[PDB]
RNA sequence: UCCGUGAUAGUUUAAUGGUCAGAAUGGGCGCUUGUCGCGUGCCAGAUCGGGGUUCAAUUCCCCGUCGCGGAGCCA
RNA sequence: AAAAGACUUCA
RNA sequence: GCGCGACCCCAGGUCAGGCGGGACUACCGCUGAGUUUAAGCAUAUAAAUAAGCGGAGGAGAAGAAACUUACAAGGAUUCCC
RNA sequence: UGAAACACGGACCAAGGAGUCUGACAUGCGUGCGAGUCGACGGGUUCUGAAACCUGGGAUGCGCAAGGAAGCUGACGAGCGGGAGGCCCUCACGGGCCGCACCGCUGGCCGACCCUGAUCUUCUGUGAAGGGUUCGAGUUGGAGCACGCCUGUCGGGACCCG
RNA sequence: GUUCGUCUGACUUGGGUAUAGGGGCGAAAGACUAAUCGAACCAUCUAGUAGCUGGUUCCCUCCGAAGUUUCCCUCAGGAUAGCUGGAGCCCAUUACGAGUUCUAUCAGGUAAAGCCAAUGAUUAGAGGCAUUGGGGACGCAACGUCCUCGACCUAUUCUCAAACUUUAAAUAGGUAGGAUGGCGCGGCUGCUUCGGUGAGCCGUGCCAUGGAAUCGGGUGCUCCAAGUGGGCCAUUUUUGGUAAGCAGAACUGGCGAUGCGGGAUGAACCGGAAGCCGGGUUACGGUGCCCAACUGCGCGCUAACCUAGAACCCACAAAGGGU
RNA sequence: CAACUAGCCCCGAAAAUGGAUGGCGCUGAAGCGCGCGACCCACACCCGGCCAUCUGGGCGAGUGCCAUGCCCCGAUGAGUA
RNA sequence: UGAUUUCUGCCCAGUGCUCUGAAUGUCAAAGUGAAGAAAUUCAACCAAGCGCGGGUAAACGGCGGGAGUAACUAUGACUCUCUUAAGGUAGCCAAAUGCCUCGUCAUCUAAUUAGUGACGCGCAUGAAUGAAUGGAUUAACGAGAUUCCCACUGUCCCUGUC
RNA sequence: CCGGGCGGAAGACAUUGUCAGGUGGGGAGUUUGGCUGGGGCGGCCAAUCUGUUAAAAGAUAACGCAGGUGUCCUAAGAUGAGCUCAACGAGAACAGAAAUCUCGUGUGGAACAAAAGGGUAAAAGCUCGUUUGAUUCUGAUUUCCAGUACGAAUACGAACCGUGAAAGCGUGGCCUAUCGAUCCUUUAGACUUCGGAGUUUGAAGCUAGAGGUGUCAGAAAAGUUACCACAGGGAUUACUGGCUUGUGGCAGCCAAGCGUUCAUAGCGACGUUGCUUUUUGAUCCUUCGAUGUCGGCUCUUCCUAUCAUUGCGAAGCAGAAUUCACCAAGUGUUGGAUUGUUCACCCACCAAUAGGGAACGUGAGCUGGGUUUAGACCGUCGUGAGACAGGUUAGUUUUACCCU
């Protein structure tokens, strides 16, 4: 049989890790006491500050105001077009600017959003990663559910007082231009977590993988394994409704 | 293997006939269950599901050779006497007839 | 070479369960056609040589010739 | 409408 | 509200006192192998053993039958034959 | 198979160093007692781990044969041939008589198995009686048991070492 | 040591810190994880197992093997039988027994022979013979004729056979040659006889050296156990193979379990099995000297410059040539 | 004169560390074949002495006692496991 | 799988995989109903799985053979016929891949089984098993493999001396 | 202002627990014959049969010879009666070489299921008739042989049947092959037991059959290892040496031919006799608790079947090239190109560029390029791991001071 493959490593340990501290803090959204008709919760851009932890910036959004029992500061997600010094509202009756958060039931029909809540208070679940953005499809008067057509072009009933942010996340365009070097890859990937080069299976020993021995190169056995398929068994190109490099299209729910 | 008469004359080893009277041939096989047996032996010594003694599956135990497999069953007190070793097949057997030999056509 | 595997009409290859063998194409013959061709009707086997078993063998065995593949170490 | 292809030299 | 008693539930470096660890020969529980044997090896054997863990005493466990029997019935428990 | 071996080990020497011990077994041999035998779990007792004494036994045997239920229930009781030795006769050679050990063989009897089934009888029991190419570690005129030693046998680390 | 790769980055390196054994870690070599890595090290279970290798400890006496049969995941080993010893058990020249011969009588298909005996192979002719194998010539034709070539047929002829044999040896092999026998007498049976007819088995009587030869410094019998379970060799017989100091059988003797003497020398060949000695006498093999012993006698042969010759096995050797 | 028969010698007959009737050497042999005597000669054979073993005897009537002793026999004895 | 440039063809039969698919088949327990005094027995239902259908090769991989046919000749553009899941396309090739093989040849050297470029029916190449990289004397980078030239030198001729 | 349901989502769904089916090299444990001229590849000589080997009783082997066995049959069994065949000749509309019919001759030359070999004639064949013993019981006996099991066979008994006039014969097939433990199940026997007594289901027994192990006296089993490990082995390979010399090399005999003629200057068919180990196998004798592979580099000795040179004999030797034979190892027998290759094959010299051996001379003398480890690439084969008498690259050469 053989030694334990690299993926069941993940469990736990400082090894497996990665620096989560580094990191620069908390992305959550702070929750709303009510109200906000136009800053009754205001907040001031003070700074846009990069996070290591998926090279993207949030902007850092302080919020100040006293009492105790009061709850406030710290980074909401960066939009396009947010400048310092622009006051940021969170709540139920902002208004319709581009960096605000607020129900997406407020927000008409065909708007493009950033963040949207897979129940309330989760604080952002769809459309985080840089360039993507969701747009809410679909509302009408309805109470229960509001429709959004998600960056993977899922049609989504999700509640109707789920929040969401105008506009699309920032730092767009990221991933599309090319490292040029293995070097500029390792960075990056050292920053977050996972462990940089990939070893193929047919270079590994039959001992370590599946794919691994024969005398002169190639994997095996058909590379693709059922998904019901156990721990261990479970390898390459799992449940794959086709391969061969042809003519597919993103995630078409129909409705 | 051969058809031979579903009718014949045979000796009867009971006591109310014990002569040679008309029989008529037909298998009687069954099989088992009522746990007392091989099965409760099996319940208890499986021991987490182990099959034992229970496989000697590989190394053929089947092969196309047997011997007679006959019982004649008797009409006229349906007792009925087996009949010693012969070679085997398979066994012709239909209601018979005769497999009458000399063609003409 | 050892262990396998075939051969059947001019050619290319189907088939049988023991009494019995086909197709396609080529060719040979008319017809189509100004004239050939496409098309259209007609036609034609040592089932390798070889013995045996068997009522009866193209068919079921055995041998051999030829033509093939696939194995043959520590080399 | 699809079944319609060839066809020696001096000429 | 304050509810005498109290009801229910918390807190004392709280009043008088108590627990851990050891020993672990022997004992009482728990939990649990394989080599080996089968001239191979899995069921089985080793063994309800070794290892692992907890807890007492000078002994400990057991203990006055929801027993054994099928008899003019034996009669808690233990150990030996 | 063959070791001087161009097989393998061994520089030399001292001292360690390997078929043992046991439980349960077979044979042999010895000892006791003997249709019994075996004290020692125990109790009595003591000069004190002893020795002495003693109990009912229990174990094994004295009858068996079946898978089991069980078995008229195993007591009528045996011949023949070679037989040591003795006896008798004969001077002896031999002859006759009795014949053991032991061996071979032919029967009867018992159980299991199969037939046979009287008189009787709580109604299917009964088992006189006559048999059988079946079968038994039986009876047909038992021998064991205890102790010990060698050797064999098995469990044990088990000749020693890996 | 020299020579040399890299040397501002996927750089170098310390300390602190994380990950531990079917686990880790790995820019992946099954690499590495404290001189330790295709699963670390340590203690325990464990005094683990191993048909296999090594070693296995005082003496003398007497007897004394076997590598074979049968079964086996068995062919490096067990069970099994045999051989071998012990303990005896029973008689004792009575008795019967025998790797033996004779006699007398069976069985046998090898050597060989045979083929004009059957079967199978196989050579050569010769001579016949056709209502239908083929040609030609003579013919109108023929129940015509002649040549020709084939078949067949007949008497010959030639040579062979493990899987051919009528035939058919030798050496081998079996049985019998008596008291464990014969005969007389007269009993029983469900057998057998249509019948006491017969068969078998019982009691009783008669007949000895007497049933060819020879031997039994005795034999017969029972229990139990060790070792062996890889054999090897020579003469002879023999299968495969060109052969082999080869592989595999048949018979027997050896070696193994064998020195001594001989073959210079040699585990197996030759001679002979070996207590301890003196004296004698031999075997094998020798007698010129080595090397104990006739340079003895007798009668031949041999002259070898392209290898004089010189003791079975055995240390090689041939066709063919010589005025 | 020719063809043969078969003796020895010659040829055929050429291998490597130098070399082997075992050696020296041997020519009316010490060679080769053969005969005849004499002779030499194994733990063998014989005779005698002697050992143990085995076999058959024998001698205890006590009061010299090994009586499993002592004494007479004859044959036999290699010896691994 | 391995920068770029460029191109990645054919085949889901097989082994895998997939699915709003299968339509109720096969099909477990619990559960349900019937019989039997019951133990129990039988029936239907029975999911997932299986069977069935579709999709899938930058998943693994695979990617034919016989003949005939050009007016010297040979060869076969041409065409047949069988057969398969599909019949190797683009390319590269006696290549670190070719047994035969030192293949035939243009090659450098006097002489080259080594190197190159063709041909290549290629024993047994080939398209992310990744192929090629715009005639070429086809550049870059390498303590890589290989070959040839020049400088250089005791590597050698032929050795010597310190 | 009032409401102790923090506030949302989700909601008897998920979850969790226990059985149940599926899946599961992911991980576990384990296994992956023997005979065998090493062992694998291959084959079955694995359980069996026929004739032969097998050397005339018997026993009797080899991966000895030529083959066969896991079947076939309600008759191809059993029994009786009838009949006689293979073949050939001579005849007979059609009909020839073979149709069907007839007679003679006809020892078996046929037929009796099959492999082969026996045997057999008023049959065992062939045909007809009647049939079902191819039956029931349980021993003995013969083979294999431990004088065992098992199978199969023999002949009886005790039953009951069958056939035929009956006497008789019949326990499968004319004889020699054609088959199977305990467990467990299944079937039959109405018997026993289920143990405090009964009754009834169910169950368990005993006796005789069936369902079967072909490694066939009867484990429950797939690969790889050049990443390998360990116990042993020269019982055993690859390597040296030894026996052998088919295969290889060298040398003869005979002489039909060739050579203008003319067998033999020089050659020499068809054959045939030697020698050598300078080819390679065969073998397993010796060594695996250890004899360092191949080539090259270097250096020696020897061998002659002598290429040259010395000195000679032949000639289809006129000269001369050249070819043959003799004594002879005294003395020479070469450099390069390429390949690890010795060998090979060229270039080029030359009097000549002979051939062989010495542990396939030559590693404590070297080199380490080949072969032949661990890394790795490619192709092929393989599901895979891996393998490759296919290619390709990089990869540790220890110790003499002892004795001769």
Not at chain 1, 62 to 77: A, G, M
Not at chain 1, 93 to 100: D, K, P, Q, V
Not at chain 1, 137 to 164: E, F, M, W, Y
Not at chain 1, 172 to 177: D, V
């Amino acid at each position: 049989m053989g030694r334990v493959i690299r993926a069941q490593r993940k469990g736990a340990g400082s090894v497996f890790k990665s620096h989560t501290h580094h990191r620069k803090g908390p992305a959550r959204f702070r929750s709303l006491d009510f109200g906000e008709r136009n800053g009754y919760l205001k907040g001031v851009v003070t700074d846009i500050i990069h996070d290591p932890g998926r090279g993207a910036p949030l902007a850092k959004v302080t919020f100040r105001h006293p009492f105790r029992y009061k709850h406030q500061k710290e980074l909401f997600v960066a939009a396009e077009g947010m400048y310092t010094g622009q006051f940021v509202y969170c709540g139920r009756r902002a208004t319709l600017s581009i960096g605000n958060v607020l129900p997406i039931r407020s927000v008409p029909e065909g708007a493009v959003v950033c963040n949207v809540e897979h129940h309330v208070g989760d604080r952002g679940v769809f459309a985080r990663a840089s360039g993507d953005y969701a747009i809410v499809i679909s509302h009408n008067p309805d109470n229960g559910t509001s429709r959004i057509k998600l960056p993977s072009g899922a049609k989504k009933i999700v509640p109707s007082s789920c929040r969401a942010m105008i506009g699309q996340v920032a730092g767009g365009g990221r991933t599309e231009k090319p490292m040029l070097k293995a070097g500029n890859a390792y960075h990056k990937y050292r920053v977050k977590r996972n462990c940089w080069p990939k070893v193929r299976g047919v270079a590994m020993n039959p001992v370590e993988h599946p794919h691994g021995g024969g005398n002169h190169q190639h994997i095996g056995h058909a590379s693709t394994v059922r998904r019901d398929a156990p721990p261990g068994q479970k390898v390459g190109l799992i449940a794959a409704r086709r391969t061969g490099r042809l003519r597919g299209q993103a995630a078409a729910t129909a409705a | 293997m051969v058809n031979v008469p579903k009718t014949k004359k045979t000796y009867c080893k009971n006591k109310e006939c014990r002569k040679h009277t008309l029989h008529k041939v037909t298998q009687y096989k069954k099989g088992k269950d009522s746990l007392s047996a091989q099965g409760k032996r099996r319940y208890d010594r499986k021991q987490s599901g182990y099959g034992g003694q229970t496989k000697p599956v590989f190394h053929k135990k089947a092969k196309t050779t047997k011997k007679i497999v006959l019982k004649l069953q008797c009409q006229s007190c349906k007792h009925y006497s087996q009949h010693p070793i012969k070679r085997c097949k398979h066994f012709e057997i239909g209601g018979d007839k005769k497999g009458k030999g000399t063609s003409l056509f």
